[PDB]
């Protein structure tokens, strides 16, 4: 409610965020041509630093 009047109601918003993970033994040069095959605006992909 935008004020104090009403009948003590509550709305419950939630946002489920998902996370997955994959290892590779790959060279760090061909990682980009696996990176440049999707546009897919609703994801967030990150590549681990190569020093391991």
């Amino acid at each position: 409610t935008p004020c104090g009047e009403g009948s003590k109601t509550w709305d419950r918003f939630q946002m489920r965020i998902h996370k997955r993970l994959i290892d590779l033994h790959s060279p760090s040069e061909i990682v980009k041509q696996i990176t440049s095959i999707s546009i897919e605006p609703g994801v967030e992909v990150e590549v681990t630093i190569a020093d391991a």
Binding site: M15, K19, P41
Partner: protein
């Protein structure tokens, strides 16, 4: 410097989107605005406008 937690990652680049969707509502109201859509990369990012009358903007 450093980046922040994945919980406050996603509300940040949603409240990014909620902010400029309000501004471009206020600006492009005279042009048949009908929303936006964003793509963020670690490069050149692109905000495509879904305006109808594109000759006015």
């Amino acid at each position: 410097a450093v980046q922040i937690s994945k919980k406050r990652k996603f509300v940040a680049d949603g409240i990014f989107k909620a902010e400029l969707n309000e501004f471009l509502t206020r600006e492009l109201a005279e042009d048949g605005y009908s929303g936006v859509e964003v793509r963020v990369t670690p490069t050149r990012t692109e905000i495509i406008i879904l305006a109808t009358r594109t000759q006015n903007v």
